[PDB]
């Protein structure tokens, strides 16, 4: 039988608990906020990316715009350069991460993702392109920029670019080719012996086609065959919404239907060479 209480261990524990509860309350206040999202949308807004640049925005990234005739505002990627030019980007290819075999509604409404860094693939949506490019008495321009698999880039410019309403199947129109070292694939290409191939591969005045909404000049279905949505003729010489091929080079054996269905621009590279990157972007013509 021994007589030792000690018991300071008990009281020292109670005090250690009361102090621990203080530490626990302090940790709670540090775990209230969510994960920080690197993706933010800018505050400045306007009719388009040029209007936004005119209001003093200097950074390329994500912005809401609302053309006058638009019922609601919508998000876009704006490219803003050191000279106050604000490009509205409506198409981007970069790495093959997004499937471009999409239907009429999907091409109408848009698909893919928008990033502040401009490092994502997307189609903005035909309805939006139509709204931006048909603002009352504001001539627009389109720039197509292409990158090959060896880091070379080229461009093609089209003056008075317009995309028509859904009632005219989002018809592509422009007044003239305004130059650029990629050449004018929208004028079609003289591929071979057939005297009508250049006429049937041009894109000016072509209605938009998807697999489920065929508005091309072919007995068959260009968009279904080539797995895309595009302003098809019979069928194409520039085809930026085509299948992404790693390394550029592909062949008839690469495809289910036997046709050139890659990301092509026939005036710059053979139709069996598929671009590493493409950008389709629009700006008021007077900025050029």
């Amino acid at each position: 039988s021994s007589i030792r209480y000690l018991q300071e261990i008990y009281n020292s524990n109670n005090q250690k608990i009361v102090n621990l509860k203080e530490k626990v309350a302090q940790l709670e206040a540090q775990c209230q906020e969510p994960c920080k999202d690197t993706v933010q949308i800018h505050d400045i807004t306007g009719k388009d990316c040029q209007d936004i640049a005119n209001k003093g925005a200097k950074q390329s990234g994500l912005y809401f715009i609302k053309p006058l005739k638009a019922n609601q505002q919508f998000l876009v990627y704006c490219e803003i350069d050191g000279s106050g030019n604000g490009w509205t980007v409506f198409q981007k290819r970069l790495d093959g991460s997004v499937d471009f075999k999409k239907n009429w509604i999907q091409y109408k409404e848009g698909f893919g993702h928008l990033s502040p860094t401009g490092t994502t693939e997307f189609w903005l949506g035909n309805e939006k392109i139509h709204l931006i490019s048909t603002q009352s008495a504001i001539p627009y321009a389109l720039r197509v920029e292409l990158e090959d698999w060896n880091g070379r880039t080229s461009t093609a410019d089209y003056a008075m670019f317009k995309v028509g309403p859904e009632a005219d199947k989002y018809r592509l129109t422009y007044a003239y080719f305004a130059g650029g070292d990629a050449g004018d694939a929208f004028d079609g290409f003289d591929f071979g012996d057939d005297p009508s191939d250049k006429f049937f591969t041009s894109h000016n005045g072509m209605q938009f086609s998807t697999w489920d909404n065929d508005n091309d000049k072919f007995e068959g279905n260009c968009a279904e065959q080539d797995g895309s949505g595009w302003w098809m003729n019979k069928c194409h010489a520039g085809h930026l919404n085509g299948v992404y091929y790693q390394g550029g080079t592909y062949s008839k054996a690469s495809t289910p239907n036997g046709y050139d269905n890659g990301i092509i621009w026939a005036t710059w590279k053979t139709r069996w060479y598929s671009m590493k990157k493409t950008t389709m972007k629009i700006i008021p013509f007077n900025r050029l």
Binding site: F191, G192, F200, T201, G220, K234, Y259, D260
Partner: peptide, 4 residues
């Protein structure tokens, strides 16, 4: 491309 073209469709012959």
């Amino acid at each position: 491309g073209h469709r012959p």
